[PDB]
Design a binder for this molecule. Structure first.
Ligand SMILES: O=C1Nc2ccc(Cl)cc2[C@@](C#CC2CC2)(C(F)(F)F)O1
Lengths: 520, 403
């Protein structure tokens, strides 16, 4: 039927010459039957002992022929990656009706590069010992071989190609041995095209199940539950118990996460806290009062089904973003007011310290990136930030950045800049020279020496001290380019406590001028 | 008719991940490629071909058509070297116009055993389809081998116009053609257009680009500067001493002893300090030392060209082209649109200058997050080449010492 895909071994390498394991006469028997039916169908063919190559085989009444091609595969060229990523459901279009077609005898319908067959040679032992065994070789795509998946996919799409142009209404997504066919056709006309397809495939030896022997919606797929006009995630059930093991908690969190893409409100902050210090996947962690509350809240949220709507090219994509806790963002992408195509969370803490502006901006990128991936275009953004505030940070920051069309949305908590460094020294404000203590222009000083502290950490401490003892307005002079940079980036949150302490001071001051000067 | 090109010994073909594209661009590439296929420039390929090079679609400024841009960067680094030396005269021309002689490669076939390596893919939205894959049959635009292999036919196809009016210095870098001269702005665009027809009578319709001209003759370096303050506060001086101290790394002649003295004890920042004859003279010297680039900075062709860029805010940027730290071969600036649009315009601007001056593109160090650059750079980029680049987090210290 189809033209063959030329194949070659990896360079330098030669075909496999691996020993055929001993086989029971019952195994020998079952195999000769299976192998004679396959020679009757042409899948394989008998060859003479001139072929020095060989792949091991075995059998696993119920009998089946399993050929071990791992060795050959080690020697077989690399092929173009069989379908890398898979379409997120939020990116599919709404269909009136859809039919999934399972393709049987898939690989058993595509010839094999003649020039390559010899390399797939294998041998089944003859019952009588005096006599030699039978040597065959595949003429089709051998289940288990390296290129089969890719060579098959290729062919398929080459086969669907025509039918497709003759049916511009119908949408077909190919996935492994499945064939998802959808349309906006009336129930009757749909089942007809489907049968058309089924024959267009049969025409090349491709066999699929008929109308009664076909799976019907919703299609549970790759962790989702797909309807023709809507989707959702596979049903999620939060176990009930009083003894949670570290492993238990991890799986719970994992599940909880897979849900955020549709269920808004899911939180894991507290359940994740339970993993601190854990010493074995089988260690038991009692649920804190906050964790119990979280679980309960998620149970409830999960209790009532939610569902994602499909992409409607006609309309615009809107992405809305909110802050739901320090370093915690939530967003949703819709086209029609509140009809969510998809939702999600972002907690990515990029860098040791940041602020809501940098973070928020980083969320736009992720969202933007996945939007282009799922829909091919970027969504208009509705952000809890004012354009003035963004631009303030914009120009200040030494790093370039861009945010597509977006409109401010007055939905607390609005993201802001809790403090800003005066660009010029303050007249009349005391001056603190810091190097682990400090000296002011007003004669004041305090040299403290702390136990257990990094050099980098000793600096911030001094600056900290300085802030603590200073009035509402203060000028600070450090030789630490580090702390300078840190504070200069105007963080509002830090993993370090010191920082946070300092940030507290900054927010409190009326005016702070930070200056750097080389040491020594 | 094909010339046997190979890869550097032992190297395999590129397998570069294709960055997600927008439906707008993809469609553009579909039309484009469906036509290159129709013309046998490219051909659909099968699964036995595991290679890949990223492809993109950029627009031609003041032109309605889209352009397929292929990131052969990975490939070009793995392609066998080929054994005209860069003209030190071009940089000295009054005006250089840049042309897109890319369509010229479209005739020369590509050695069939090398074709597989030029494989690329047109992604599909949401992976709802496997995505269209092709390879080239003719010399591809952007591939290092193309200009080389076509070196010959070019020399010939240019030999007449070359010696006809040799008062012009023509130069080829990849798909581009840099045409320099000293004609008057009018007499230039004239003989400039003529070359365009002389080439039409040989291969492509060849459109110029950036349609404007460069004026290398006027490219001036940006020396380190110092605040010309009327009165000097303790702060002013500190920023001064500091900047100086940093610039001493490059100019050993610089001194601050007298300036540092003006900063005795624990003085209040805003305290205005009057400058002392001694120091005042020391400053003027330093200032005088900075009036020009540090001596002994020669371009070593065996080394790569690095280009760092900084954001000074206000839509203004500073850059430095060098090979060895503190030994910059050049510096300048760019002014304003948004942050990304500006950076690309700069990168491209700096690369063009680099090509004219050294006939080589530099390795950039961009102050941006990869994912952001990857997302928008193709939005304003219009050059036919793509420099190598990296992503850094510049210290607001070095940014406080330029411009
Ligand atoms: O674009 C659409 N619309 C759609 C709507 C409902 C369902 Cl259940 C399936 C689809 C579909 C698909 C698919 C595979 C990914 C699952 C189909 F191709 F139509 F089959 O892609």
């Amino acid at each position: 039927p189809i033209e063959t895909v030329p194949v070659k071994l990896k360079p330098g390498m030669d075909g496999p010459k691996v020993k055929q394991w001993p086989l029971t006469e019952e195994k020998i028997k079952a195999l000769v039957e299976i192998c004679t039916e396959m020679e009757k169908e042409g899948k394989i063919s008998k060859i003479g002992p001139e072929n020095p190559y060989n792949t091991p085989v075995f059998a696993i009444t119920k009998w089946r022929k399993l050929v071990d091609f791992r060795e050959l595969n080690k020697r077989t060229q690399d092929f173009w990656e069989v379908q890398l990523g898979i379409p997120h459901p939020a990116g599919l279009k709404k269909k009136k009706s859809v039919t999934v077609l399972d393709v049987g005898d898939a690989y058993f319908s595509v010839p094999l590069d003649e020039d390559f067959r010899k390399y797939t040679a294998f041998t089944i032992p003859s019952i009588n010992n005096e006599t030699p065994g039978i040597r065959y070789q595949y003429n089709v795509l051998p289940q288990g071989w390296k290129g089969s998946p890719a060579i098959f996919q290729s062919s398929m799409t080459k086969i669907l190609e025509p039918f497709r142009k003759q049916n511009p209404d119908i949408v077909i997504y190919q996935y492994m041995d499945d064939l998802y066919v959808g349309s906006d056709l009336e129930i009757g006309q749909h089942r007809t095209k489907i049968e058309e397809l089924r024959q267009h495939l049969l025409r090349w030896g491709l066999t699929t199940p008929d109308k009664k022997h076909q799976k019907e919606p919703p299609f549970l797929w790759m962790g989702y539950e797909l309807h023709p006009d809507k989707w959702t995630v596979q049903p999620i059930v939060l176990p009930e118990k009083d003894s949670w093991t570290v492993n238990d908690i991890q799986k719970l969190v994992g599940k909880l996460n897979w849900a955020s893409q549709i269920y808004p409100g899911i939180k894991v902050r507290q359940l994740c806290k339970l993993l601190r210090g854990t010493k074995a996947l089988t260690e038991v962690i009692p649920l804190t009062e906050e964790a119990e509350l979280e679980l309960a809240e998620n149970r409830e949220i999960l209790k009532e089904p939610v569902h994602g709507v499909y992409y409607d090219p006609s309309k615009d994509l809107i992405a809305e973003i909110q802050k739901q806790g320090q370093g915690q963002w939530t967003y949703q992408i819709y086209q029609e007011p509140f009809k969510n195509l998809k939702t999600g969370k972002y907690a990515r803490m990029r860098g040791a310290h940041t602020n809501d502006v940098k973070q928020l901006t980083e969320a736009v990128q992720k969202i933007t990136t996945e939007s282009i991936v799922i829909w091919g275009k970027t969504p208009k953004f509705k952000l809890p930030i004012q354009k003035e505030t963004w631009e303030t940070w914009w120009t200040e920051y030494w790093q370039a950045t861009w945010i597509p069309e977006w409109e401010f949305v007055n939905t607390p908590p609005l993201v802001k800049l809790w403090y800003q460094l005066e660009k010029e020294p303050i007249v009349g404000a005391e001056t603190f020279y810091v190097d682990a203590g400090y000296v002011t222009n007003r004669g004041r000083q305090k040299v403290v020496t702390l136990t257990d502290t990094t050099n980098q950490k000793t600096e911030l401490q001094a600056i900290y001290l300085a802030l603590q003892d200073s009035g509402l307005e203060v000028n600070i002079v450090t030789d630490s380019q580090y702390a300078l940079g840190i504070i200069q980036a105007q963080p509002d949150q830090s993993e370090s406590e010191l920082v946070n302490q300092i940030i507290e001071q900054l927010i409190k001051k009326e005016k702070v001028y930070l200056a750097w000067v080389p040491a020594h």
